[model samples]
Target: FHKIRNEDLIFNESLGQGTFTKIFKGVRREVGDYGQLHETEVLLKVLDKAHRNYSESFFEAASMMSKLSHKHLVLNYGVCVCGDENILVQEFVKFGSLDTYLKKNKNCINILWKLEVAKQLAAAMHFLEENTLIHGNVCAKNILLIREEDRKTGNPPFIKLSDPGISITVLPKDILQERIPWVPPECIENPKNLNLATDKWSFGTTLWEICSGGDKPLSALDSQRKLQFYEDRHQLPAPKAAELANLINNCMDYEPDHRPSFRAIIRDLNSL
Candidate 1:
């Protein structure tokens, strides 16, 4: 992995925060062939020192991620480990997370645009499946939006999935507890054991959020009620498109074996 010097990065704003890390917008300066410095926008995820025990895990995950190249997946430039801090350097995604974008442009975005969003995520997940990696967490907040400038014209913004970085179980207790709603029922019962099936469940939840224009699953209910709602044989909220709702239902099936794989989902979505 390429190591970015700490002094070469200039922090801009705090993009977001998670269990053991804080994301910041920054400019990375590098010397060019002319010996002049060029600046590039990047997202820096700095790990909290108190949770430094997982530095090794960060490096392992980063190494695995470096070999990946998908337009819909957030590009990981490399990682930086200096003293107690471990930072992940990633390509800057301008529009930020899907949840934030949807919230801001809920009614403005068309149905076709939403479908494209789903397709991008499905493609990314399929790539992960091919590599035998589980995203662990698949939610709206984890998806990022990219808007490239027009060197010409008529260019539009696109979506890219991000933050498939660390294991959810190893995250801070409070953060993990808060994300319980997005997790599958079986995983909640056995937090230590998460597989592809569990990720499918979270993907279903994320799809629900997408279809509903960023409404989180069971948002109206308390955490206890939300858990109970899923524990009981309750129905999932339906999406506007009945066909899409059926796809999500299949992913969210109570039995893990009943859930479809990322490959199947990508095929179905492409056919749609």
Candidate 2:
């Protein structure tokens, strides 16, 4: 029951609870040599002792993130193991999840802002692929649009890719059972080996979500209804603008080998 000194855990009621942990707000305090005199907002991700998902997921996250660093990925401040819970300290990104903003704002973000976010996302993926790391989970829900409040700095809001704790090794044949239907056909049959090509397809779908303002299948509909529209008919809500459609459609191709690598996608996005 040892509470973190000078840090009162604050929970956001609006944030729905997940299977493992619930996020809350916390203030920056003395953390080893990274001590600070000023108070800063931070998100305290508390993993409970009774939760198995938290233990496994947290371990995987720590191991995978220890080797990666990029502006577009959520900055991993550090892991806290002193308390009874396995808590993760991270930056308190104000914009919330990509879905939250897009749904509320109607996908009308300024063109310049969208382009900047796209570039940031591309850069992060570029770093991951370059390091031979496989991000099994890449989707809009996982792509967070960081808050950009300091305009004078000339730094645009960046997209921080989150939730990369999925199985990193070569995917198994059983993976098809858990695949997201919206994923491209080429990604359905999970073979023993996976590489950047699979990530390309996932990123393509993420682009669609970003361009469409996150107006996805209505949550009111049943899983069957959503699956029918998503898979059986291949009908996705069209993006408000056609800006990233070509790149997305190309990556959505049925042939795995046909998708472009992150490097190629970066070039295409830059030209746009």
Candidate 3:
């Protein structure tokens, strides 16, 4: 495959937004030596031009993604830096994220397939932890649905993770009041702190979201009254075949020490 270049990309409408990047649905056009033209779809993650450490952060993420090669993780084509555009070109997983996918297809999605997604997700995180990589954030939005074939035919849907949490040097603008629910308790107590354990907690919460058909962790009624879902609202969505419930709860434990490591989680899941 040719190394994708800035000249080859024709930016279309934006795909979505990342921590500090604006993602676009782009077309990479290349001309072969024989004069044939090739056009392929790609996702362009562009760094925010005004960010203080835009270059440093973008390069940091690029380097991290560059070293990773796992089916569960999103494929990075290459990083392109031309003029003011600092872009990370990637394989086009799909038009929607995990939550949207789950929500959109919940009625037809099967429990076995959802469990498969859970196991695969745990395996991917285990891989990252083994390499000393901490996913700063883990949420449904970052997981992209690649395909949905058949739970009836015993095939699980495809998924890929995007946006390694390391690139986000700062917390979201409204880290407290209008907070995203995936954050662990420690990060909420001190916005500056995040740990590997925190990632585990986030994963557990995300797992609950997936199993529960992408439902919001906290109800609008509860959150509107008190914005403490990250901590006090530690109730995990119940389920199972029992093992699934325990696994999700263990991952989303109130005390960080109580939470299982990604390796342990994968081992438990592999047995289940």
Who wins the lDDT comparison?
Answer: 1
Q: After superposition, how far is residue 9 of candidate 1 from its true place, in Å?
A: 0.9
lDDT of each: 0.77, 0.64, 0.72
Clashes of 2: 0
Between 2 and 3, whose lDDT is larger? 3
For model 2, name the residue pairs that clash. Answer: none
lDDT score, candidate 3, position 196: 72
As a whole number from 0 to 100, the lDDT of residue 204 in candidate 2 is 76
Residue 136's lDDT within candidate 3 is 71
For candidate 3, lDDT tens digit of each residue in 119-227?
8888888888888787776888888888876647866677777766333336453544344557666666675666778789889878877877777666463444335
Reference-based lDDT, residue 35, model 3? 95
Cα error of candidate 2 at position 215, Å: 1.4
**Which candidate number would show the highest TM-score if scored against the true structure?**
1
